[PDB]
Symmetry: D2
Subunit: 333 residues, 4 copies
């Protein structure tokens, strides 16, 4: 299985192609569905506000892109059940619209002639994969799978490390998170989420995220043990996740840091830093998550101990590297 279609050629959809080209994948993107013209999709692929010029040639015709000399069909079907995936034989759909985040909704792609769907987002109780945490759970009979959120890909490897080394008894997460297209440019209606209606680049905006709540899909032993939320802030990409835990063991900072470093050794998904980085330094990262030893904090009074651990993530490109790792493995089962 080598032929892919992308539904939603947005921030994530376009970076999916960029990354596949970058790693010289044997996956072949044959079709793209969105809501617009090839002309506009070509413009957006070529010029990127966060990552700069597309490294390959880009042209278009009235119904296709031509990327690095290869033709990619472009469709504009707002209902996935109408996407003509069989025309170019798209077998695996990378589902990056935000409108099909359940097994029932993504079933449309299979009805439309595809064989498998990989959803770029949480999608309820289905196989949900953070690469290098639970990718071994992908199965030859899986047809619809989720890679959860960027935040999940940031939290999970840190949570796995901690839990494996020390035990996590309970914990709460706050991500300080780059603004995304689900937010608003100027104050205006944005469905039922009132906070989402507020000007994103001019505000700190509290936001609900399921990353902690649904972590049991990725690390079953942590089911129900974590909660958390996001503060959306005015940076264009690059985010940071803080986790405050009660661990099963008394620890030093050096001990937590040492365990995290071991977990990141030879781990292409999970990086380590002890440099005093800031968010722009994570832009373009090829990890899902980069644990930051410099922010580790142990607060102890008598017998009680809280442990704060912190990890960076490029919620666009870093997350995409994870999605592609998952896609490559998925495509072979």
């Amino acid at each position: 299985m080598s032929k892919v279609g992308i539904n939603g050629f947005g921030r994530i959809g376009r970076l999916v192609l960029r990354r596949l080209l970058e790693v010289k994948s044997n996956i072949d993107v044959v079709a793209i569905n969105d809501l617009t013209s090839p002309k506009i999709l070509a413009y957006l692929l070529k010029h990127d506000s966060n990552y700069g010029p597309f490294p390959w040639s880009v042209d278009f015709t009235e119904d296709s892109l031509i990327v690095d000399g290869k033709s990619i069909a472009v469709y504009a079907e707002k209902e996935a059940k109408n996407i003509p995936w069989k025309a170019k034989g798209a077998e695996i759909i990378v589902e990056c619209t935000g409108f099909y985040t359940s097994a029932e909704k993504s079933q449309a792609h299979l009805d439309a002639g595809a064989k498998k769907v990989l959803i770029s987002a949480p999608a309820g109780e289905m196989k949900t994969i953070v690469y290098n945490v639970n990718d071994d759970t992908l199965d030859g009979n899986d047809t619809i799978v989720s890679v959860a959120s960027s935040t999940t890909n940031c939290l999970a490897p840190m949570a796995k490390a901690l839990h494996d080394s020390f035990g996590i008894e309970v914990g709460t997460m706050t991500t300080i998170h780059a603004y995304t297209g689900t937010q608003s440019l100027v104050d205006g209606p944005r469905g039922k989420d009132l906070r989402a209606s507020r000007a994103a680049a001019e505000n700190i905006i509290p936001h609900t995220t399921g990353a902690a709540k649904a972590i049991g899909l990725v690390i079953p032993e942590l089911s129900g043990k974590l909660k958390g939320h996001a503060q959306r802030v005015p940076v264009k990409t690059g985010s940071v996740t803080e986790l405050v835990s009660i661990l099963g063991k008394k620890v030093t900072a050096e001990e937590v840091n040492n365990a995290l470093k071991q977990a990141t050794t030879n781990n292409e998904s999970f990086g380590y830093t002890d440099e005093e980085i800031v968010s722009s330094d994570i832009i373009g990262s090829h990890f899902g998550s980069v644990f930051d030893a410099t922010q580790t904090e142990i607060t102890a009074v008598g017998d009680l101990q809280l442990v704060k651990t912190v990890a960076w993530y490029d919620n666009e490109y870093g997350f995409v590297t994870q999605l592609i790792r998952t896609l490559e493995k998925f495509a072979k089962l």
Copy 2:
């Protein structure tokens, strides 16, 4: 006292500030109905909490079908097609059309078919009477039913062009506005209609953008038809904009002479202000003028008998423009 009943179509950046300003000046206009695409709950939230102008100055509550503002009920509708808005239910006769989707005489006709009497469009709307208050509001009369107040940029450019034309003659000119980003632009890089540049992250770029302000200035100042062009550079400020005009004038001038002429034009002028202070864009946020001429930026470049004159005016493209809209509304309502 004329008590005209008003309806607002599009309770957006402009539509919400229209209400704010009407209450602020204690207008005799009664806003009796609002049409948008959402619930009273959401509109109440947006009216109360404003990222640019802070807490609404009056109480705001909602019911299942209304806003209650300072104790007065305003019916809320959600008809995406204007012909279906029940403007007759609360007697809304003048519609302040602020959706961006009815910017022509043919499209705003739907408000009249739905039972309103008059429409004031908060944007350019092609070949119709187009009013910059204190420039050409004298051209209004009792027979007008659908009128435009043009763009924020027009409201900035027109008083400055008028003053220059009246004092010196403008022979030809070009404008560039360095302009706050607005809701027509994009939060993240993504399709935004057919304008390629408008697809790009607005808070992260300088983005060239076309504006008709200079091209259609002739609707406002007929003598300058076809003598002006220009465009915008959209930049990452949330509101507050500035318009530069480079002109060949009908006579040789000094900067002092230009500045004095502009000062005279702003004296006892509620619409057009003047400054010789070294202000920046956040200083214009909340302006009660459609335009403020900035004498500190005046520049004369002269070689032999050739002269280029650069004149610069700030504007709050949100609230400042709204003050112009309301002045035109209060006049248009009484005719």
Copy 3:
């Protein structure tokens, strides 16, 4: 009453101190300002504010003064506090807003220069430190140099106090998502010894040390040593939010925590309550030191192990200034 004030450092805080004093028609008169610049530049900065808009009163200047709402304010430019000629106009209480005199040892220079008392707008070591309506009762007539701690302290303390009083705080850690300030950098470049502080403040999320939690014991003695925390500086111009994750001395529900907080904010000029879905720009211009936000309360529990997250907004500029002024007024009458 002491009634004559000098401001040292007519900066974000110093200018807003004057604004607030005139807004509340205090009987305190500002008779002198010291900074490093000209009256022209101070008048320009006072008239024009990027965060709060035009100054609400008339502003003019001479070669050695400001004239504000028709009242003359002397302007000095002495970089060393000991040299400031405070006695010329009888400045009694110095509001110290430069950031350069954050200790009793440093700020006593003002006294050498002829002042009677100093109120420092920042943490200043282990001196008496006041969060209004948390421990301002500890002030007395013998206090000569006093601190009002940081904006973050003023946000954190009334929340911690309410929780501690109702339920007990056994241990906790704070993270404040905090507007950038003048201590940061516009473009990437050296900013003393702190590496992170060198980075472009409007283009990054920047981890940053704060003493608010560490030194909370100056303000709430029973929590001495029980809290730690830090900041993430982010690109908003003012308006900040503080999260505290606590182990409490009692099993609780979110409603119970929210009700206790609501009670503590009733008839409390310093400490507000909200259950509206606000964002940071809605706190800009707040007249509170701290606004507890019920919408963000979260209780995470497995058996007897319970974490409690509580969240309060604060306008680190003006809201903090309202606290500084409340303290100042009281300080002036002891």
Copy 4:
């Protein structure tokens, strides 16, 4: 000459080193003078908010940087006359502090034992070079030269092409310009300039530039014929210069754009675009100026004609590519 010293390892200073390494120059930076430690300089070189991680290894010792395995001395001398340029034999100083922008001030480097100085800014009445406009004016007797400002490097090539093809009779420019370190993060004193006191990331701020005023040093024929100024705005780097001119004959937009296309042909200093780019697309440009045919505008009323031409520039890196070009030539004379 192949040994360079950098004074002011700032935005421009650090990028100078980056660009020298990128083009594999035979110039070697042997010393750097600034106001801080090697540790802080190394941190700053390594992690860049605008251009991302440094492409070569960077380490530090107590007295130096190690960059790509080579040692560069670090000094911290506030006054240029005390800088030990002779210790490592620094021959040409790239003067990037902003405090020595005159022949008389930059003499202190020669007094301290350097042989030449290239100033990264306008520096009064001395030879002022925009590469591929007037670098032919340099000779072997020059010892202190200027490469003018970012805006000068943007303006000059566009003015040269217009004036050569059509004649410029008079003109005024406005650059819509990224904020720089001369501005203020929060409202507060910043020298005598009132507008420079105001928070740069939250305002449009009118600001002087002498690029047009002193354009005569670069294009003597245009001396006294141009004025202009800037509007500093909240983007981190990437700028755009508009020039409104009265030309020496009647033109069409196509005529202007073809003349500009021809001037940019085989021109390493000066680029052309007819794509609908925005400021983030110029970040990391290897040109001093990129003329933009999409924004050309002719306003004609009988005999009277205004011509508006627009060119992008990366005021950091793009400018630095011009600085290095001039540097490489200056080193050989």
